[PDB]
Amino acid sequence: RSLLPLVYVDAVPVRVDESGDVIQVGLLLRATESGHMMRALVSGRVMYHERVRDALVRHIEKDLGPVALPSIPASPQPFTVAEYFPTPGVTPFYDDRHHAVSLAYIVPVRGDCSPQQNNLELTWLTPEEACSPRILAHMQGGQDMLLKQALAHAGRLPDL
Protein backbone atom coordinates (compact mmCIF):
# COMPACT_ATOMS: atom_id res chain seq x y z
CA ARG A 1 0.00 0.00 0.00
CA SER A 2 2.92 2.33 0.72
CA LEU A 3 4.83 1.00 -2.24
CA LEU A 4 2.81 0.83 -5.48
CA PRO A 5 -0.58 1.76 -6.98
CA LEU A 6 -3.39 -0.80 -6.63
CA VAL A 7 -5.57 -1.90 -9.55
CA TYR A 8 -9.19 -1.31 -8.58
CA VAL A 9 -12.59 -1.38 -10.24
CA ASP A 10 -15.53 0.90 -9.75
CA ALA A 11 -18.84 -0.25 -11.09
CA VAL A 12 -21.79 2.10 -11.22
CA PRO A 13 -24.85 -0.10 -10.74
CA VAL A 14 -27.73 1.13 -12.86
CA ARG A 15 -31.31 0.23 -13.77
CA VAL A 16 -32.04 0.78 -17.47
CA ASP A 17 -35.14 0.58 -19.68
CA GLU A 18 -35.24 -1.45 -22.93
CA SER A 19 -33.50 1.27 -24.93
CA GLY A 20 -30.64 1.27 -22.40
CA ASP A 21 -31.72 4.57 -20.89
CA VAL A 22 -30.46 4.88 -17.34
CA ILE A 23 -33.57 4.90 -15.12
CA GLN A 24 -31.96 4.66 -11.66
CA VAL A 25 -28.57 4.64 -9.99
CA GLY A 26 -27.99 2.20 -7.16
CA LEU A 27 -25.91 3.48 -4.26
CA LEU A 28 -24.78 1.49 -1.25
CA LEU A 29 -25.30 2.98 2.18
CA ARG A 30 -22.94 1.79 4.92
CA ALA A 31 -21.36 3.23 8.04
CA THR A 32 -17.96 4.89 8.18
CA GLU A 33 -15.41 3.68 10.72
CA SER A 34 -16.99 5.86 13.42
CA GLY A 35 -20.59 4.85 12.83
CA HIS A 36 -21.35 7.79 10.57
CA MET A 37 -23.23 7.27 7.35
CA MET A 38 -21.84 7.30 3.84
CA ARG A 39 -22.76 6.33 0.28
CA ALA A 40 -20.60 4.50 -2.23
CA LEU A 41 -20.25 2.82 -5.58
CA VAL A 42 -19.35 -0.81 -6.05
CA SER A 43 -15.60 -0.50 -5.64
CA GLY A 44 -12.81 -3.00 -5.18
CA ARG A 45 -9.30 -4.25 -5.79
CA VAL A 46 -8.27 -6.49 -8.70
CA MET A 47 -6.40 -9.60 -7.60
CA TYR A 48 -3.14 -11.00 -8.91
CA HIS A 49 -3.96 -13.30 -11.82
CA GLU A 50 -7.57 -12.14 -11.89
CA ARG A 51 -9.18 -10.63 -14.96
CA VAL A 52 -10.79 -7.24 -14.58
CA ARG A 53 -14.25 -8.30 -15.82
CA ASP A 54 -14.00 -11.20 -13.35
CA ALA A 55 -13.23 -8.74 -10.57
CA LEU A 56 -16.30 -6.83 -11.76
CA VAL A 57 -18.26 -10.07 -11.53
CA ARG A 58 -16.88 -10.91 -8.10
CA HIS A 59 -17.40 -7.45 -6.66
CA ILE A 60 -20.97 -7.10 -7.92
CA GLU A 61 -22.05 -10.39 -6.34
CA LYS A 62 -20.31 -9.33 -3.12
CA ASP A 63 -22.25 -6.10 -2.72
CA LEU A 64 -25.52 -7.08 -4.41
CA GLY A 65 -25.94 -10.87 -4.31
CA PRO A 66 -25.50 -13.80 -6.78
CA VAL A 67 -28.68 -13.10 -8.71
CA ALA A 68 -28.07 -9.41 -9.52
CA LEU A 69 -27.53 -10.39 -13.16
CA PRO A 70 -25.01 -7.75 -14.10
CA SER A 71 -24.50 -6.92 -17.75
CA ILE A 72 -20.72 -6.86 -17.54
CA PRO A 73 -19.59 -4.60 -20.44
CA ALA A 74 -18.56 -6.61 -23.42
CA SER A 75 -15.62 -4.23 -23.79
CA PRO A 76 -12.72 -3.70 -21.37
CA GLN A 77 -12.61 0.03 -22.06
CA PRO A 78 -13.87 1.82 -18.93
CA PHE A 79 -15.77 5.08 -19.17
CA THR A 80 -13.00 6.70 -17.21
CA VAL A 81 -10.14 6.01 -14.90
CA ALA A 82 -10.35 7.33 -11.39
CA GLU A 83 -7.00 7.88 -9.75
CA TYR A 84 -7.49 7.78 -5.99
CA PHE A 85 -4.49 9.38 -4.31
CA PRO A 86 -3.30 9.07 -0.73
CA THR A 87 -2.85 12.83 -0.68
CA PRO A 88 -5.93 15.03 -1.11
CA GLY A 89 -5.88 17.82 -3.66
CA VAL A 90 -3.95 16.07 -6.41
CA THR A 91 -6.70 14.37 -8.33
CA PRO A 92 -10.44 14.53 -7.83
CA PHE A 93 -9.92 11.18 -6.10
CA TYR A 94 -8.66 10.34 -2.66
CA ASP A 95 -8.28 7.33 -0.41
CA ASP A 96 -6.33 7.54 2.79
CA ARG A 97 -5.16 3.93 2.61
CA HIS A 98 -3.55 3.72 -0.77
CA HIS A 99 -2.86 5.01 -4.24
CA ALA A 100 -5.47 3.26 -6.33
CA VAL A 101 -5.97 3.43 -10.10
CA SER A 102 -9.50 2.24 -10.92
CA LEU A 103 -11.14 1.21 -14.17
CA ALA A 104 -14.64 2.56 -13.83
CA TYR A 105 -17.66 1.00 -15.46
CA ILE A 106 -21.38 1.49 -15.62
CA VAL A 107 -22.89 -1.90 -14.91
CA PRO A 108 -26.61 -2.50 -15.47
CA VAL A 109 -28.14 -5.12 -13.24
CA ARG A 110 -30.72 -7.36 -14.83
CA GLY A 111 -31.52 -9.28 -11.65
CA ASP A 112 -32.67 -8.71 -8.09
CA CYS A 113 -30.51 -6.99 -5.54
CA SER A 114 -29.88 -6.63 -1.85
CA PRO A 115 -27.13 -5.17 0.37
CA GLN A 116 -24.75 -7.77 1.75
CA GLN A 117 -22.17 -8.08 4.53
CA ASN A 118 -20.97 -4.59 5.39
CA ASN A 119 -23.57 -3.06 3.05
CA LEU A 120 -26.48 -1.88 5.18
CA GLU A 121 -28.76 -0.60 2.43
CA LEU A 122 -29.04 -0.32 -1.36
CA THR A 123 -30.80 2.78 -2.65
CA TRP A 124 -32.21 3.22 -6.15
CA LEU A 125 -32.26 6.88 -7.05
CA THR A 126 -33.13 8.77 -10.23
CA PRO A 127 -30.25 10.88 -11.62
CA GLU A 128 -31.90 13.97 -10.12
CA GLU A 129 -32.10 12.20 -6.77
CA ALA A 130 -28.59 10.73 -6.88
CA CYS A 131 -27.21 14.19 -7.53
CA SER A 132 -28.96 15.72 -4.57
CA PRO A 133 -26.28 17.38 -2.46
CA ARG A 134 -27.51 15.42 0.56
CA ILE A 135 -26.72 12.28 -1.39
CA LEU A 136 -23.44 13.38 -2.94
CA ALA A 137 -22.36 14.69 0.44
CA HIS A 138 -22.74 11.22 1.86
CA MET A 139 -20.21 10.00 -0.72
CA GLN A 140 -16.52 9.68 -0.02
CA GLY A 141 -13.09 10.10 -1.53
CA GLY A 142 -14.54 11.88 -4.54
CA GLN A 143 -16.82 9.07 -5.64
CA ASP A 144 -19.52 11.71 -5.97
CA MET A 145 -17.62 13.10 -8.94
CA LEU A 146 -17.01 9.66 -10.44
CA LEU A 147 -20.75 9.20 -10.09
CA LYS A 148 -21.29 12.44 -12.00
CA GLN A 149 -18.84 11.36 -14.71
CA ALA A 150 -20.75 8.11 -14.97
CA LEU A 151 -24.06 9.91 -15.41
CA ALA A 152 -22.47 12.33 -17.86
CA HIS A 153 -21.13 9.36 -19.82
CA ALA A 154 -24.56 7.71 -20.02
CA GLY A 155 -26.02 10.99 -21.23
CA ARG A 156 -28.06 11.43 -18.05
CA LEU A 157 -26.35 13.98 -15.86
CA PRO A 158 -29.16 16.22 -14.57
CA ASP A 159 -29.30 19.99 -14.94
CA LEU A 160 -30.38 21.47 -11.63
Choose between 13 and 44: whose C-beta lies nearer to Na ion.
Answer: 44
Residue 9 beta carbon to a second copy: minimum distance, rounded to whole angstroms: 10
111 binds a second copy (CB under 8 A): no
List the single partner that 116 binds among a second copy, Na ion, Cl ion, none, CB under 5 to 8 Å by kind: none
46 binds a second copy (CB under 8 A): yes
Measured CA to CA, the distance from residue 30 to residue 2 in angstroms comes to 26
Q: How many residues bind a second copy (CB under 8 A)?
A: 62
Q: Which is nearer to Na ion, 84 or 156 (CB)?
A: 84
CA-based R_g, the chain, Å? 15
| Residues within window 54-73 making contact with a second copy, judged by CB under 8 A | 54, 56-57, 70-73
| Residue 52 and residue 9 in contact, taking contact as beta carbons nearer than 8 Å | yes
Distance CA 70, CA 74 (A): 11
* Shortest Å distance, C-beta 114 to a second copy: 18
Residues pairing with 108 in the sheet: 14
In the bound state with a second copy, the residue whose beta carbon lies nearer, of 6 and 38, is 6
Q: Residue 94: which of a second copy, Cl ion, Na ion, none does it interact with, CB under 5 to 8 A by kind? A: Cl ion
- Decide: 158 and 128 in contact? Cβ < 8 Å: yes
Residues 6 or more apart whose CB falls under 8 angstroms from that of 40 comprise 27, 28, 30, 139, 140, 143
